[PDB]
Design a protein around this ligand. Structure first.
Ligand code: MG
Ligand code: NA
Lengths: 301, 283
């Protein structure tokens, strides 16, 4: 089994460190597909992506929103990139009308005659897939954190009353599975100060966790730091700037496009997001924000 | 009279009543307001000004959409070369749509004119005395730049006609203007007052037909109102008339007493506009 000697820290005041030295997480979110190859996890296509991100100065990848190919864990081990390996998107509530996503399987039980191997089978699929991922990569030096979800309360129907319990259970499952790494998630409701997000962030912190906030700005990073002094935080998802390659005849997305493309100037982002200079400006200025995971490194299908 | 293609040489109305009452033949309508072809003739005939005129007006409810929602954009100019631009609604930056250059022709007696001979020219030769682009519609501004044969810009203060058309807002305000702000107190002299209907930003709303009412007071009398609309049977001697295609006119005549003339143009729900005409005596 491949291994590497290394340790990390997350301080609520000064952020992240590797082997005793402070390091700023300069990260990107990356989906699994390889473009014109589709979803095929070709090792070289994978390695080329990382090489291209490294030349950008990136030093960390968030595997949004699902375990990576083992090949991607192999390259970062070798290349010296820090991986945050996220296991889930939704939890036990399906998103975006996607009635066949993992939202419908998350809470289901595993059948006795189902001889599938990999993780623990005594509870739900959620625990099986979570521990199966942790089992494959528990020794991977690149992996610094386990992310347990992403915008779990977003684009769903029904009450969210149940999520702080589901959250605490996933955290307990992970701490028991591997004690050497902090667990985390990416929550987009912290900026909206949902009671349930406060409760979940506290459970994260109590268990040696790290709270990733999706799409906070400078003003919202600061309140989090004020009202929750015990939390160590970072931008789990940031910017979401929207641009075409090589388009210059307008400098904004301020008007409605007509050629199905967008400006290449950094003045274009979604309504919940921020232009690249703005999402980085907010993070670099604040020692208590360990880093950023820009949505995205590469375009995806 | 002669309202061809609604003409009739005996008695009886043509089409439903009110029927077209005046001609459509004129380069200029009855009220003295130029039609678009006016600037074609100007690009061809007037050697003392420059011309750069764009049609159509650029609102969705007045344009024609052909193949691919392409709107036929026409430019009348005497300039050597034209660059055509588009500016999105609410933007400050334009992009180059197209660029076309004329070719100069000379007759045996020395007369010269211009025809477009580029690759996408019209198969009908006379239509190349002007320039045409097919532009997909989108809210905003179509603008043009004109250049001489030395590729030197011909500035806007040296050019007549609409070098830009833009998507307007809803009718907001009247804008009146007297062609002569002082006239003779001889009981004959006239002042022509052009009233425009524009949105909040002074852009003429191209299909505005707001009924405008004129209030004249002072040393003068209203003697006519007009809009040049053929089917409009409203009295010329009224104090009110619908605007047509954004414009309406009032005509005021002096008295034989020196003084001033106050004219206010009003329309419902619209900001009103006022002018003042002074009348000077005779020795
Ligand atoms: Mg007759
Ligand atoms: Na001329």
């Amino acid at each position: 089994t491949e291994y590497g000697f290394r340790w990390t820290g997350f301080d609520a005041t000064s952020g992240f460190s590797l082997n005793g030295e402070k390091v700023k997480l300069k990260g990107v979110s990356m989906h699994h597909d390889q473009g014109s190859l589709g979803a095929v996890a070709n090792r070289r296509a994978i390695e080329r992506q990382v090489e291209i991100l490294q030349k950008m100065g990136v030093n960390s990848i968030r595997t949004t929103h699902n375990p990576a190919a083992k090949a991607l864990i192999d390259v970062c081990n070798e290349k010296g990139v820090l991986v945050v390996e996220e296991v889930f998107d939704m939890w036990n509530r399906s998103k975006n009308g996607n009635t066949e996503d993992y939202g419908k399987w998350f809470g289901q039980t595993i059948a006795g005659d189902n001889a599938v191997l990999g993780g623990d089978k005594d509870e739900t699929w959620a625990k099986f897939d979570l521990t199966s991922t942790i089992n494959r990569d528990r020794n991977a030096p690149s992996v610094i954190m386990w992310s347990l979800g992403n915008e779990m309360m977003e684009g769903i129907s029904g009450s969210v009353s149940d999520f702080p319990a589901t959250s605490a259970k996933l955290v307990a499952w992970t701490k028991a599975a591997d004690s050497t790494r902090p667990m985390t998630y990416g929550d987009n409701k912290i900026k909206a100060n949902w009671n349930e997000s406060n409760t979940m962030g506290d459970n994260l912190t109590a268990n040696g966790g790290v709270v990733g906030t999706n799409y906070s700005d400078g003003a919202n990073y600061d309140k989090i730091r004020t009202t929750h002094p015990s939390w160590a935080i970072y931008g789990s998802e940031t910017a979401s700037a929207i641009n075409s390659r090589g388009i210059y005849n307008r400098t904004t997305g301020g008007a409605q496009s007509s050629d199905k493309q967008l400006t290449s100037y950094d003045n274009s982002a979604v309504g919940w997001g921020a232009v690249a200079s703005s999402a980085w400006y907010d993070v670099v200025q604040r020692d208590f924000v360990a880093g950023t995971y820009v949505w995205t490194g590469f375009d995806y299908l | 009279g002669e309202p061809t293609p609604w003409n009739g040489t005996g008695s009886g109305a043509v089409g439903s009543w009110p029927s077209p009452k005046n001609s459509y033949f004129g380069i200029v309508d009855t009220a003295g307001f130029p039609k678009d072809t006016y600037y074609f003739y100007q690009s061809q005939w007037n050697d003392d000004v420059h011309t750069l005129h764009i049609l159509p007006a650029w609102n969705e409810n007045v344009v024609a959409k052909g193949s691919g929602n392409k709107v036929p954009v026409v430019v009348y100019t005497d300039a050597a070369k034209v660059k055509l631009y588009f500016t999105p609604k609410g933007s400050t930056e334009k992009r180059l749509i197209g660029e076309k250059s004329f070719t100069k022709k000379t007759t045996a007696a020395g007369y010269t004119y211009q025809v477009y001979e580029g690759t996408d020219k019209d198969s009908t030769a006379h239509k190349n005395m002007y320039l045409t682009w097919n532009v997909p519609w989108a809210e905003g501004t179509i603008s043009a730049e004109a250049y001489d044969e030395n590729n030197r810009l011909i500035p806007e203060g040296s050019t007549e006609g609409n070098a830009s058309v833009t998507t307007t807002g809803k009718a907001a305000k009247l804008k009146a203007d007297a062609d002569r702000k002082t006239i003779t107190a001889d009981g004959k002299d006239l002042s022509y007052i052009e009233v425009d209907v524009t949105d909040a930003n002074g852009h003429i709303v191209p299909d505005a037909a707001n009924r405008v009412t004129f209030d004249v007071k002072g040393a003068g009398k209203l003697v006519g109102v007009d809009n040049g609309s053929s089917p409009d049977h409203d009295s010329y001697q009224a104090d009110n008339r619908k605007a047509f295609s954004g414009k309406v006119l009032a005509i005021v005549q002096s008295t034989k007493e020196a003084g001033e003339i106050t004219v206010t143009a009003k329309a419902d729900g619209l900001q009103s506009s006022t002018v003042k005409i002074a009348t000077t005596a005779v020795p």
